[PDB]
Ligand binder design. Sequence first.
Ligand code: HEC
Ligand code: HEM
Ligand code: HEM
Ligand code: HEM
Ligand code: HEM
Lengths: 93, 93, 126, 385, 385, 247, 57
Amino acid sequence: GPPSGKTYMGWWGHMGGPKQKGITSYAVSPYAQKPLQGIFHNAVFNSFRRFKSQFLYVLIPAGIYWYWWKNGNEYNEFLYSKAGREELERVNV
Amino acid sequence: GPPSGKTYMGWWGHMGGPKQKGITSYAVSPYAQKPLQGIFHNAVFNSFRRFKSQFLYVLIPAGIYWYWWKNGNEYNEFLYSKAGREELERVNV
Amino acid sequence: PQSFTSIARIGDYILKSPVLSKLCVPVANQFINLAGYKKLGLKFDDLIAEENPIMQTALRRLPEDESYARAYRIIRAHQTELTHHLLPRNEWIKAQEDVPYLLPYILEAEAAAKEKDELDNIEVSK
Amino acid sequence: MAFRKSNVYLSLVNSYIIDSPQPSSINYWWNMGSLLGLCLVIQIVTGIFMAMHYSSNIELAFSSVEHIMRDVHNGYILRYLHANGASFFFMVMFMHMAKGLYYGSYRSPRVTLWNVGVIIFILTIATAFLGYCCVYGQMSHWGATVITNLFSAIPFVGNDIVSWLWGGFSVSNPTIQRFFALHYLVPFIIAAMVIMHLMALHIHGSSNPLGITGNLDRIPMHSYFIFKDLVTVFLFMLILALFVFYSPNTLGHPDNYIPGNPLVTPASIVPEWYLLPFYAILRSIPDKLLGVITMFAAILVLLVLPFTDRSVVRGNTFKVLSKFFFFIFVFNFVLLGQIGACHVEVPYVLMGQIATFIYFAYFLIIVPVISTIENVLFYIGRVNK
Amino acid sequence: MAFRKSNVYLSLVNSYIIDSPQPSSINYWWNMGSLLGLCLVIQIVTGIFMAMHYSSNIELAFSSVEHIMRDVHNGYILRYLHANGASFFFMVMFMHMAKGLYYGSYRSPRVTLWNVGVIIFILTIATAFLGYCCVYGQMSHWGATVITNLFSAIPFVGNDIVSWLWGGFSVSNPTIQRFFALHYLVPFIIAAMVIMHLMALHIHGSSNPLGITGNLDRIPMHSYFIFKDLVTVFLFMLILALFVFYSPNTLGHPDNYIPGNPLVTPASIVPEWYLLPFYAILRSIPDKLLGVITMFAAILVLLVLPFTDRSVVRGNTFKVLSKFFFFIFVFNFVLLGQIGACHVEVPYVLMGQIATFIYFAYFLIIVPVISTIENVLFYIGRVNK
Amino acid sequence: MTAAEHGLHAPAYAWSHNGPFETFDHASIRRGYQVYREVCAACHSLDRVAWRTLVGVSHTNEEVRNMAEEFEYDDEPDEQGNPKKRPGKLSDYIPGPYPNEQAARAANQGALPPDLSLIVKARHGGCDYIFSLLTGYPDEPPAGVALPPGSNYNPYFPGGSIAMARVLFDDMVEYEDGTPATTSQMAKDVTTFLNWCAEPEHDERKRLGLKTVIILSSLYLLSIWVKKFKWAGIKTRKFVFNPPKPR
Amino acid sequence: SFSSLYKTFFKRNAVFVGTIFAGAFVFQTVFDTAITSWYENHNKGKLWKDVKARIAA
Ligand code: HEC
Ligand code: HEM
Ligand code: HEM
Ligand code: HEM
Ligand code: HEM
């Protein structure tokens, strides 16, 4: 068939990475391993490390936007009440 | 990408035919030619050559099945007429 | 799909017999004349479907002058049938020119493949 | 390299349409596949633009088709385009299968291509049947009744399969709504199978009328076969335009404009004309189970073809007896359709039985014997001994 | 070679599923694409099995959906599966798009992948809209009325486009049958676009959460990511089974069980929840033409993101300010949806306009400036001069 | 089957709309509507033809509004929910004489009269079959035909025994334009009218067919020329073969 | 002046396809009018305008 363009990924044998030397990999058979090893240690400790690392980025925008939505909702419930109809007609007209 | 199986067609450059030496092609530009050259000669002469060589294979079996169909149609029309009701009940029962 | 050893076996039995030769060879000559591949500049050993390993082996082992001649006859037949014409009667393949050139290579590669199969499926008498 | 080569999608378009090496010597019978692609595009577009207005209830099916003919602007154009284009879809498909049968395009490299085409033929037969039943005329109801009462011949689970297909106890509003839903669904399965047909054709290329290798003289498909296909595309549009505008109800049966009535039998329950040969193969066997087995075996006997063709050269281009028996087969198929159009009467029973025997003896008996005879005659005509 | 590599079709299944080299370090956010394929198979299958019973007339749309919910065996299973699976389709689609926005999967190799993804997003939004209008409840009719009366703001041919979409003079019988034909058709365009998505993915491979090159350490997709995706497939099925069998009408508006009445306004016209941010970006602009132009720009501003992401490392894995503003964008999207669910009242109008401005300033203003500042900080934190 | 069970095949009359450039005689459609309203509408329905489609074919707008007002249809119920009738408009359909099939079968000896909206297309033969059925009533059936009571003989009906009595007699309809209404003239008029009710797109369809056939024939001939032009450089190739030197 | 003819109309492909669309517009209008006039003139006396003029006289 025809050849296609220059891609940044080959297949098994010519992936197009750097030449690798000196990097030696060791693995064991899963049949000779314990799966579910360390899950009670990682569940209470490594999960706590990941939560300590990445909760300000997810929680400070959540705090800002939830406080904004709650304040806007409380201002709407003040506006369509009986005590704030003067301010309602002022800010609507 | 991954390679596919051994096919009997390559592409432009590596088709998979044999090596060719000595066969020389000549082709002049169509912008220097006459399209519709020879259409009246080949309309009545080449067409008769092709029809004469290839009409017995198409006209003997067509005639066989058309004669069979016409004979069966005439026999059916004779059977469900008034002249052939005795033969109708005989070949029906 | 039919093996060329089988065709050669049946054909050699028909040709060696004196009754069957005189009965069936003129019918075969008329069949080949009516088939009309020689009217396009082709021998029969070009007509064989080359898309199998036996035929690819035979076309690989075919020598170079026969290969270039066969290639020219195939391209000539393609140009002729493109033009919807025939070859001129001076350029038709003569009957003495329609010689089986690919048949010994086909039969040799076929005998090699049948021997390979029979040796892959032996049962040693023990 | 060029942008039609280096792109992701334009490389597919390029290697299938633009740069695709076609042989130089293929003739106008090789335009039938492109014509089938055009036919399928026509059917899908017109069918969507009529499914915008069609109502698939049993009380609204025929009247909604009659609303398409009457109230929809250019709706008769869409309806006649759909009906006559399905008839032309089967005309061109019979020419495509007969070209594969003549030139031997089923053989040793292209066997998977042949089997995918047979799958497409099954799916197109089924789509034509379901869409014919979608009209709910008199022929739709009784054709659906016969061909779905066929499945009550299976000994164990026959009535279960039948009442599951019907959705009830006869052809009714559940069956018509199943048939519209499946008639919408199935042409996209056909389009997927057409893409797989194109893959299996693309790995090995087209054959040529000679049967010899096309690898030597080859021509790009763009600017040569684009226009060689455009000629037959415009011819197909011309004949379809004649059959859509001037004689629009020729190929249809005139009973379909009767509203669908289950209590009135129209005295000749006949399917569309492109199902009449398999209907005659059905009716030739005097058994309900063996008849539907014989009809499905008539469609699936195309798969015995690359194994029974004992010929050593490809295609009947240079074979006298294969030419003669191929055309005996073609006009036997015509006679079988003409038998299936007719009533079950005295010469027609034996005529359809002998023609069904010829239809099956071509693939199993005629082709190996004739091709072996031609191998032996081709040998002894030029071997001197 | 193996038969999984040498075959025509099994080489495709092999090179996409079985031997597809994924990087070793990708996480469970890379399971959402396979989950979207599962959602599409769920939607198409339950859609066909309800189209066998649904009737698209304006008198029989709601009655036929209730026929599915009452008379059809397990038809409540199919209807709740279709509806809540569409909600889950859009949940997993927002997760797929957000992980693409986060890990930089839109950059220089995969711009074609990102753009085909945006086309799939547009087509899936359109499919969900037409299928919601197929029920013909109260929110269906009035959602159809509002969103198709949006196109009467185009000053040249707005009334022509509106009366062509409606098929008449309001949303009616031809509108609902149009929408049903289109809702059947467009998911097969989504399936073809998913195959184009897989082509654009396959030519360059997946990204990894580090952003660095993945050519060094790779793993074949079978036996590792097959079961790694099976985990999330069973988790998705578990959450969908909870929402189908125990809380089936939580994600639905309760006004859709009122039949479609053109003479009664239901006092809050609101589409399905996954179109609510785009409904808010619509209602923020106080003009009908600029509002629908801003909604189409809200869908089409993701095409600007490959050329505004000025970073030199890919993905916000190692970027502090980009991480903070990415989750500000995410919770701005949630605020935009909750704003569009609300009525048009005094704090909500200003909050919706501000949230729309933050939505458009993320791609156009915030991302180039923050990525340039992070480029400068990454340089000067380790260059000593 | 027998020839009596097939029916007599109707011959090929020279209609004014047979032929690829022809149109319905629209005055014949007008006279056919007159013979429908005065004869055929007593037993036959026209449930697919709206009044508004008659405008511009056989009558004028104010001419069809009077007929539509002459019939009555069901209105939306009044403020008290009672059923209400209404004089018709253009948008309504032509009403049949019987309220249901059982009323029709009560009035016509148990044989349901079919709805004549599609019956030119619904029967093999078409306008020829309708004309030959309407006129081909023999005064005496052929000797030996066991005829049931209440069934007349017509050789064009399949089976011979039709339950429609002969309803076309000479000068039963006083035509508006003074056309001499014989039985065959009235049959020609209702057959043209029923063919219009079957295919009301007939004139425009043949018009568009002429446009389409001219454009596609011109495109086919131009595409043949363009094919031969693009293919000339390949079609006139020449191969020579000087065999190479041995190595 | 075939050189001038080629250099004007067929050298630039933009002017070529523009002349194609301009000719297609003029062709659609004129040819539709010609087929309508030929059809209505071939069928004289059978159209509703002629039946209406007969009713008017
Ligand atoms: C009074 C009662 C009438 C009148 C005034 C007409 N018709 Fe006819 N018609 C009638 C009956 C009971 C039947 C059923 C016959 C049967 O099935 O045995 C019919 C049938 C027809 C048919 C169908 C013929 C067929 O099925 O092959 C046609 C085409 C038909 N009628 C036409 C027709 C026309 C054109 C009339 C007046 C101008 C007309 N009928 C009058 C009962 C009655
Ligand atoms: C594979 C291609 C198709 C074939 C062969 C096919 C075949 C048919 C046929 C033979 C009929 C009956 C025509 C008649 O006698 O009136 C029909 C009807 C119909 N088809 Fe299809 N069809 C195809 C594609 C489609 C698709 C994809 C749709 C749906 C979008 C569709 C919608 C219809 C509809 C609505 C009818 C209703 C009756 C009518 O108006 O013709 N068709 N089809
Ligand atoms: C929707 C229906 C189909 C479409 C779109 C289709 C499409 C195509 C196309 C485009 C080609 C290439 C052009 C050609 O060779 O004619 C082709 C080739 C082929 N098709 Fe089909 N096809 C269809 C149905 C079938 C059927 C029903 C069969 C027979 C079982 C079949 C068998 C073949 C074969 C054998 C070839 C190769 C012929 C050759 O080049 O030697 N196809 N098909
Ligand atoms: C792209 C995937 C699809 C999506 C996102 C989708 C979305 C939807 C949605 C949201 C509804 C309204 C559900 C409700 O609230 O009751 C719906 C209804 C419907 N959809 Fe789909 N749909 C999809 C695929 C399909 C397909 C392919 C079909 C047809 C074969 C289909 C047939 C239906 C039908 C009949 C309804 C009618 C009401 C019902 O029974 O739920 N859907 N669709
Ligand atoms: C029917 C909908 C879709 C399906 C089935 C689908 C399928 C897939 C699959 C299977 C992958 C590879 C696995 C993965 O990386 O997660 C993928 C990757 C991707 N998809 Fe989608 N996708 C869909 C919609 C979208 C949408 C809406 C977008 C966003 C515009 C998108 C953008 C991407 C991107 C950027 C990648 C590459 C992710 C990476 O490798 O880092 N897709 N898609």
